[PDB]
Design a protein around this ligand. Structure first.
Ligand SMILES: [Cl-]
Ligand SMILES: [Zn+2]
Length: 89
């Protein structure tokens, strides 16, 4: 019941390379495909993903989405809580 992490709609935008998520607190996250890829849950310097895109967004139960990326990587289950957290980190 946390409005911050209840998604209303998800819009992966291929041209601008950002995934928008509207949340129940009225916030919309705009998370770049690049950012999502380099923070994919599935000191090092993680780089080289500026040209990667999200090819598909598949819901996982009610708690997460699986993002499929253009570099073949398709593990990466992102919980709603995690996606919201990426808006600041
Ligand atoms: Cl971002
Ligand atoms: Zn980050």
């Amino acid at each position: 019941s946390d409005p911050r992490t209840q998604p209303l709609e998800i819009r992966p935008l291929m041209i601008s390379r950002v995934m928008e998520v509207d949340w129940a607190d009225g916030h919309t996250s705009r998370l770049t495909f690049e950012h999502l890829r380099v923070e994919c849950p599935c000191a090092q310097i993680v780089t080289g993903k500026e040209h990667v895109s999200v090819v598909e967004v598949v819901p996982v139960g009610h708690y997460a989405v699986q993002l499929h990326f253009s570099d073949g990587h398709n593990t990466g289950i992102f919980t709603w809580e995690y996606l919201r957290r990426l808006d600041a980190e």
